[PDB]
Design a protein around this ligand. Structure first.
Ligand SMILES: C=C(CCOP(=O)(O)OP(=O)(O)O)[C@@H](CO)[C@@]12Nc3cc(C)c(C)cc3N(C[C@H](O)[C@H](O)[C@H](O)COP(=O)(O)O)C1=NC(=O)NC2=O
Ligand SMILES: C=C(CCOP(=O)(O)OP(=O)(O)O)[C@@H](CO)[C@@]12Nc3cc(C)c(C)cc3N(C[C@H](O)[C@H](O)[C@H](O)COP(=O)(O)O)C1=NC(=O)NC2=O
Ligand SMILES: C=C(CCOP(=O)(O)OP(=O)(O)O)[C@@H](CO)[C@@]12Nc3cc(C)c(C)cc3N(C[C@H](O)[C@H](O)[C@H](O)COP(=O)(O)O)C1=NC(=O)NC2=O
Ligand SMILES: C=C(CCOP(=O)(O)OP(=O)(O)O)[C@@H](CO)[C@@]12Nc3cc(C)c(C)cc3N(C[C@H](O)[C@H](O)[C@H](O)COP(=O)(O)O)C1=NC(=O)NC2=O
Ligand SMILES: [Mg+2]
Ligand SMILES: [Mg+2]
Ligand SMILES: [Mg+2]
Ligand SMILES: [Mg+2]
Lengths: 362, 362, 362, 362
């Protein structure tokens, strides 16, 4: 089973940042030796649609569809609830198809009654016949506060089974569906990043909420490579040539914030510390997303995951403290330096740095 | 025999990218998380002079002149025919001189009756007396659809036997010949690349078709170095100092497309994957060329070469799919980023990046 | 005891430049093959407030607070006096609180009657009740010629005990204090550097004297990381994520000189040779500071520390000789080159290099 | 004896390029696949003051002063005469002071009656009482066609014995002397390079002929470091800190040619192949100088040195052939690329690349 195999390869093989980069090493937060605040007044609260959350971080969707997967969703959800952190579940297709797969998603809401919970379906489902009703069912199954629709064409190109399909018709349908839905749609990538062209196209169809999921964290091309190697599939060697395919997370954050200045933006793909999260937010994200390190702690257990979030939160407040940022808003506006390849990326892409400074700050 | 030794050194020694670079690591194709197409509608067909080809890739000229060499030409040709891929043969000098060497070229047309076949003579033959008749004989011997005239002065400088000769008279003669020939001439390098000054000089004599053959692939200075080492020739240590001599393929593509915007352009030299080929094309080439990796697979056998092309084609379509490029024309216009040394090369050479963008996409 | 532990970790663990950089490798002094002077006329004297000092180098504050610490202060003070070099003592808070800790500071003046001596208290003390009287007591204890107020929020974030406090009220108080004090105030960092924003805020409260204490020297985040590891404190792994936090010394010198052109500036944090000292001054510092390498020599003994200063002074004169700088003033105006990351830092931070050149030369 | 030790350290210890760089890796000669010439027509002749020389390369001054040194001067001189190559002798101070040292210089003219021979005294001699008469004696001793006056302040700073003296009076005297001398003066560095400031100051005193001697070849600071280590002298560690002190040869060539456009320029310091020599000349030098590798071959024997010059000349013609440069003039004008640190050096130093292109081409 593909869902089990995915979790096992992500958690126990070497695919985190494999031959790829976030370009976050190119972003420096300027240290403020006179912060102007004290540690105890640092306020980490922010908005997440109609709800308030305790920390500008979310867990992005990963799993569900059978009981061992549901027990990972349970650990993640009950810890996220405790910490006031939003949580996306993984793809719900399996539970649209099979009633026994429902509980492994529903459990999330039982144990996390108050945080934002975000449903999940894949864009390809929209050209294979999914419509309003499947979306409402994904949403109602966990009383979702939003639904994420994922883009994973890279993964689909290199996986043994099948071929990606991304006709514009899917966007027409998406646009129709968003007018009848009572919760917002977020469009997220899954390891390879969102460019300006893709963010503007999505915007022209009514999409305002993005999750970057850039290269440099979980490498889904590497994951499929490993599944190909395991079955002696021919594609393995081709996947290896594409290991560094994608938009780096930090470049993707800049590209979505610049091309759609009023977007609500999750910066994710390789966020591994509260310092990475602070960088993502100062660059222009509204919140930082994480998947893989949450998975690996959850598999270790509830208390491991509690420790993990304590660490992320401390690191984030440390960066806020050391930049003079009393709250999330001030963090979005703090002083940064951009160097090296990220800077060359932006310049070639016509990202005028002065208008960038202005846009990331309002 | 030099032809045999050449093939043996290229195939079995360490001379592929030896101390050299294509600069293709400096070209990035911008990933499109919503491609807007489906994998099965990707069309790879393109024009090659008066014929249509199935994939925008060619095999560039390598060998011929005796029976063991002819059997390599046979394998390559019958596989290229099967895949709808054009094929250049190696230098036909030896078959102009000796009737017995003819069959080792002619076999290409016997087993490949439909694809473009490209004949081959060296530029120095033009100052050693070759004229119209030798060109017509090269062409007729394989019913060629075109003839390539090669520039290899770097190789000639370091080889033990003789000295390069490139007087302008050769171009006058080339110019005369091209008005009496019923097929087009392509001018190609052989490892060291074509600059703007050389492309403009060639153009001023009526040459419109170029094949970059840049540094970063097969290193012909290294091949000669090794021939020198083998014979204890003094020049070996001098060849070693020139290992990184030449214009990197990526820079050569930019230089030719910029200095001659209506050229028909083969991007070649170090093309090892369908992703290299995609980059070569997006940069400004009309098609990608390959020699060495085709040689090494052909030596292994028919089925090894068939598998090799399946892999190149898949990698190419993967890059087209992940950039939203439904056909070769879309690929020539797709978004890219250029960074690092390639970017510094272009700036010092006066290649205004904005006018470059415009020129590479019409 | 924290003071003892600090000295032992700084002196005997690996924390000097740990994962951090001064960016001084990006500063090059232009060699002058015809210096225009002779070695023996080189004059290293310069002003330090109302006194004249023999060398434009100071020892910045480190220790004090018990007898073994006082014996280190004594060695450093008596050598500094012999060389005509100013000396800052470490934080005097402990001697405000406990009369027995006083002698370990006062010994500095007994043994060094003429050189400038610089008192020390931490900025957080100002929001914890310290004011005029404690400042006058720190000064009188050693008949100080100045008092340094230190910023160490990074160190405080990562240390096991407590939390940093840097409300603006501290600056209000500092500003009132400075009007009743009879010696100047210097504000220094302690390993993480001073930015333009912090220098400007400090300036707007009447502070004119700065000591950069940039990253790339003693890494106080690493020191607290090590104290955390030793106690099995959870923060250790978070400290490790921040090892390269802060403004590099060279960038901090540029930022302070640019944002406050008339400041009196100590360039410190990783000054390890007379060449680093020459670099700091040519970049815009008025004098170079050192802490750690003086400590390590002092622990070895009086004669070890004498040899250390002889080496620093020789290296500084060598750099003056090789740039044609007859005095400290000529050195501040000598030709330099700025390359690589320091150059990209300055550009992103809006430090126009031409106005920089003008400002650092006046 | 210092002369013997210097030769032994340079020839047999690791001091060539030690921790230093020429920046010539940053200069690329553009390859021309159609050279437009043939190898046998390449002409390497050029002027050297009033004489003609066969190759635009010289041996810069090294040794003399006793019989074993004289025998090295004899091998180098007789080979240079055979090849049509100018030769500078090392410092003649010892032969001004002691009549027995004379023959070890004079032998150069006996064995090389036609090529330019360049006499040698140090700049500090001019403030130590040398004047016209000592200059005429240096010149007459070998019937010199020119005299080189060397700048070696870096070497003097770090050597155990003494101190450097470069008062302006030396230039006043030099300026007087050049008006009574019947041959030209060349001012050369010796490992640390010539800047714009130094070139302009020299020029204002009537100096028109320069030899860059930049960092990246023989490292005179390292040589003195090694002499210090051997005697347990304290300066050793200080010398180690200055190993990368100086203007890289490539940068010095650009600085002298830009700041003094009509100068006659020897580009030297780390020239190790005829490709380095071609780079030096294309950058703006009129000729390339070499010292160290000539010494090492001469110590091996007459036939070793003859083979060395054959290698250098072949490499130089190869680079001329591969750039379409039929003569030394065309080479000075051929297409280049400048990248990386050399490019950043030039930009910070105000060397406008477009006016540079113009100036190096006349
Ligand atoms: C398996 C998935 C469903 C689609 O595949 P399919 O089998 O076709 O599905 P159907 O047929 O059932 O429709 C993935 C999609 O890649 C997915 N599951 C899932 C598994 C694991 C185990 C980890 C680790 C990450 C994902 N991520 C990306 C994750 O949310 C992050 O954006 C990236 O990992 C980057 O963040 P870091 O670097 O890790 O911090 C998921 N993203 C999705 O939106 N939905 C998911 O379910
Ligand atoms: C022998 C040749 C020319 C004549 O030499 P000579 O003995 O004086 O001949 P005469 O005229 O005197 O009879 C070579 C090129 O030197 C040549 N054969 C030849 C063999 C091998 C075995 C490989 C490997 C590649 C060449 N290539 C370059 C190839 O087409 C590609 O451009 C480059 O290899 C770059 O692409 P990659 O990086 O590899 O993907 C050929 N190019 C040609 O134009 N002509 C040829 O016949
Ligand atoms: C560690 C300290 C104690 C802080 O106070 P606390 O523990 O809260 O105690 P209370 O306030 O409660 O009393 C610091 C204060 O930051 C400090 N002591 C002190 C000890 C050691 C042993 C070395 C090595 C460096 C400091 N430095 C930085 C030094 O002056 C240099 O700026 C930097 O080291 C950078 O320069 P290099 O790279 O090394 O050349 C000092 N700086 C201060 O201004 N005062 C000090 O006392
Ligand atoms: C010892 C010297 C004289 C001054 O010393 P001193 O004891 O004060 O003398 P007095 O007091 O008696 O006057 C040197 C100067 O370093 C010198 N001898 C000398 C020896 C050898 C053994 C090598 C190797 C190089 C020199 N070169 C540098 C050479 O010409 C090149 O510029 C550099 O080597 C750079 O080019 P590459 O990288 O090698 O290709 C010479 N330069 C001079 O102008 N004159 C010399 O005599
Ligand atoms: Mg799928
Ligand atoms: Mg040939
Ligand atoms: Mg404290
Ligand atoms: Mg001398």
């Amino acid at each position: 089973n593909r869902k089990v195999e995915h979790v096992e390869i992500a958690a126990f093989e070497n695919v985190d940042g494999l031959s790829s980069s976030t370009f976050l090493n190119d972003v420096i937060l300027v240290h403020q030796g006179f912060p102007g605040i004290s540690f105890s007044e640092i306020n980490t609260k922010t908005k997440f649609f109609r709800k308030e959350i305790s920390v500008p971080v979310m867990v992005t969707g990963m799993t569900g569809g059978r009981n061992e997967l549901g027990r990972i969703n349970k650990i993640i959800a009950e810890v996220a609830e405790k910490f006031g952190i939003p949580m996306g579940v993984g793809s719900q297709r399996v539970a649209i198809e099979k009633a026994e797969a429902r509980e492994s998603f529903a459990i999330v809401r039982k144990v996390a009654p108050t945080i934002p919970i975000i449903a999940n379906l894949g864009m390809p489902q929209l050209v294979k016949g999914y419509g309003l009703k499947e979306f409402q069912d994904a949403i109602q199954m966990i009383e979702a506060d939003a639904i994420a629709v994922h883009l994973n064409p890279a993964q689909e190109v290199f996986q043994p089974e099948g071929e990606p399909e991304y006709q514009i018709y899917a966007l027409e349908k998406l646009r129709d569906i968003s007018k009848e839905l009572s919760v917002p749609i977020i469009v997220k990538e899954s390891g390879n990043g969102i460019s300006m062209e893709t963010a503007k196209l999505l915007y022209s169809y009514g999409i305002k909420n993005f999750d970057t999921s850039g290269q440099g964290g979980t490498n889904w091309i590497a994951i499929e490579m490993i599944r190909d190697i395991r079955r002696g599939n021919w594609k393995a060697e081709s996947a290896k040539n594409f290991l560094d395919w994608g938009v780096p997370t930090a470049a993707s954050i800049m590209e979505v914030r610049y091309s759609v200045p009023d977007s609500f933006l999750v910066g994710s793909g390789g966020i591994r510390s509260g310092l990475d999260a602070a960088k993502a937010i100062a660059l222009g994200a509204d919140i930082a997303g994480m998947a893989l390190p949450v998975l690996k702690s959850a598999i270790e257990g509830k208390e491991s995951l509690e420790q993990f979030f304590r660490k992320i939160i401390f690191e984030l407040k440390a960066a806020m403290m050391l930049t003079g940022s009393k709250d999330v808003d001030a963090l979005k506006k703090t002083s940064i330096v951009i160097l090296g390849k990220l800077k060359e990326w932006a310049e070639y892409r016509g990202i005028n740095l002065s208008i960038y400074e202005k846009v990331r700050k309002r």
